[PDB]
Amino acid sequence: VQELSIERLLEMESLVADPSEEFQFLRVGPDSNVPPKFRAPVSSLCQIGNKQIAALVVWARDIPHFSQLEMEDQILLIKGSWNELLLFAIAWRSMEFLTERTTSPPQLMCLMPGMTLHRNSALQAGVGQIFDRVLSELSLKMRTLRVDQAEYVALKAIILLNPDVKGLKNRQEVEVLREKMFLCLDEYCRRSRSSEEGRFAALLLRLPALRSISLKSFEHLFFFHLVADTSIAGYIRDALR
Amino acid sequence: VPPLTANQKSLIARLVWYQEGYEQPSEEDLKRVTQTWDSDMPFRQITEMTILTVQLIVEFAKGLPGFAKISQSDQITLLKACSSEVMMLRVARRYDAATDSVLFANNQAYTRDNYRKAGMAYVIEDLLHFCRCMYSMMMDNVHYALLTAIVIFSDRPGLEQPLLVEEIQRYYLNTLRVYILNQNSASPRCAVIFGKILGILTEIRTLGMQNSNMCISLKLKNRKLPPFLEEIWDVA
Numbered sequence A: 001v002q003e004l005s006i007e008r009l010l011e012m013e014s015l016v017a018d019p020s021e022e023f024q025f026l027r028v029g030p031d032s033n034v035p036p037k038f039r040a041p042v043s044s045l046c047q048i049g050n051k052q053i054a055a056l057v058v059w060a061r062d063i064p065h066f067s068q069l070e071m072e073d074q075i076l077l078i079k080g081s082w083n084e085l086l087l088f089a090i091a092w093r094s095m096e097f098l099t100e101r102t103t104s105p106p107q108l109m110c111l112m113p114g115m116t117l118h119r120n121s122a123l124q125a126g127v128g129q130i131f132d133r134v135l136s137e138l139s140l141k142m143r144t145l146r147v148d149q150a151e152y153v154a155l156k157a158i159i160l161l162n163p164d165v166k167g168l169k170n171r172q173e174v175e176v177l178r179e180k181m182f183l184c185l186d187e188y189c190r191r192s193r194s195s196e197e198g199r200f201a202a203l204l205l206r207l208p209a210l211r212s213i214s215l216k217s218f219e220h221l222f223f224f225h226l227v228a229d230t231s232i233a234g235y236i237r238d239a240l241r
Numbered sequence B: 001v002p003p004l005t006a007n008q009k010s011l012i013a014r015l016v017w018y019q020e021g022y023e024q025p026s027e028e029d030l031k032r033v034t035q036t037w038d039s040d041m042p043f044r045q046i047t048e049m050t051i052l053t054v055q056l057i058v059e060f061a062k063g064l065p066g067f068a069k070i071s072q073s074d075q076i077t078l079l080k081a082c083s084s085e086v087m088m089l090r091v092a093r094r095y096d097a098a099t100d101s102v103l104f105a106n107n108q109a110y111t112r113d114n115y116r117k118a119g120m121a122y123v124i125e126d127l128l129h130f131c132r133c134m135y136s137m138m139m140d141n142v143h144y145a146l147l148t149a150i151v152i153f154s155d156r157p158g159l160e161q162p163l164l165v166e167e168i169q170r171y172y173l174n175t176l177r178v179y180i181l182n183q184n185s186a187s188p189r190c191a192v193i194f195g196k197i198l199g200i201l202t203e204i205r206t207l208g209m210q211n212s213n214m215c216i217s218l219k220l221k222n223r224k225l226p227p228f229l230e231e232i233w234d235v236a
């Protein structure tokens, strides 16, 4: 076994997912009220979404000690953070396409390498505010913070490694994994940017801004029957083997 | 391994004071609402008590250094978003682990079963889980006061001088850092504590949306949600 550290993690970010299993967490439900001329694209989008989820489902599991915790929990931890994780990754990628009586709202949201989402489209989908919140509160505000890959993958692990998730067979078994991360991060700020009065907090203060956005993106996803609600634990379960 | 300025301690002092100053609604107000010697009863009390809670939360927010430096536009913006999230910190403080219930300002214990009856059965299982988690947290009144303050100058959408607030907040955020740095050996665990606390922020965001959905799933059940509350939480 290895030590859960920023170091091992960064060696996992680069790790490529194994698109071997087709798991639809997201899909256009027959009972969806999404216009017909947009089922192809919205469906196509879900499919991208799905890869990424399985991609984090296999990253989560390759985290130092994560695989040790009791699976039931393991499921619940993931089941409880994918949206947040999914969205956070988008905000990261989006940082590039950031345009940063002088400034206007950003127009691009990078979903995956290459492919991007234009503002006016989200505007056509009635998700322009949430789109806007993702690029401002997250991508932009991060750029400003100059957060780097070490801080970014740390936050990630922190996001996933949440003890407050309801139903945890053994909450403290997660609290340890989190607390370790709280440390690794604090020193990293110390070591690599000690001139920063309150960076540790400014990074951890993205976590709420993120929770809210994710919480909102669920409403929208649900209004459109897009989420495989009742069937996600399973894929999570299933895939975790 | 430093201490704190005078401002800081004057604030901490100040905040610890206002906190007890407002934990409960006045004896008359409390007396007026609790008058009385059918699903509208638990409902009336819970809703009526909430209107008092919010009021207290609002006044406390104004007794905050830097608050009056905000545009009326923003002030109602910050207050409007914090109203429901601080009310969360405050239900934690009156939670009793022995009975797994919440204790209202009139010394009455409300169980998961009471919240059922009043039709708030949706908001309770999660609200009570947050309490159990805040319990084992074991925080002192400084934390709680500082935390509260922070939540209020937490970046909110609709903000005019966003950058301003961020610092008005950087202060409280900073004071909390220090106070934790003294209360224990400025050792490793010193961050671990600072983190778990800042983590309360994100959980408080999830319980905030639930409060709103409850207001919604209540207007929809055609059940008069006090105008005061309907207004402050932007309940359509």
Ligand SMILES: C/C=C/CC/C=C\CC/C=C/CCCCCCC(=O)OC[C@H](COP(=O)(O)OCCN)OC(=O)CCCCCCC/C=C/C/C=C\CCC
Pocket (backbone or CB within 6 Å): A026, A034, A035, A038, A041, A042, A045, A046, A049, A050, A083, A086, A087, A109, A117, A121, A122, A124, A125, A126, A127, A130, A131, A217, A220, A221, A224, A226
């Ligand atoms: C957390 C993310 C997980 C995975 C990410 C990707 C998969 C989820 C799908 C997200 C779609 C993003 C919006 C782009 C829509 C593109 C199609 C378009 O132009 O539709 C117009 C149509 C006009 O008709 P309409 O009915 O007439 O008009 C719309 C209502 N006014 O609009 C529609 O058909 C609406 C389709 C509903 C899409 C789901 C919205 C929820 C997305 C929020 C999640 C945050 C990530 C994406 C941020 C952009």
Ligand SMILES: CC(C)CC[C@@H](O)[C@](C)(O)[C@H]1CC[C@@]2(O)C3=CC(=O)[C@@H]4C[C@@H](O)[C@@H](O)C[C@]4(C)[C@H]3CC[C@]12C
Pocket (backbone or CB within 6 Å): B022, B023, B024, B025, B045, B046, B047, B049, B050, B051, B052, B053, B056, B087, B088, B090, B091, B094, B102, B103, B104, B105, B106, B120, B123, B127, B211, B214, B215
């Ligand atoms: C939709 C809305 C009505 C729901 C709000 C509900 O879900 C909450 C969060 O559960 C509400 C219900 C009643 C409530 O306002 C209170 C009663 C008190 O007696 C006191 C009054 C005052 O001392 C507060 O500092 C604490 C407390 C315990 C508050 C906390 C929040 C409570 C417990």
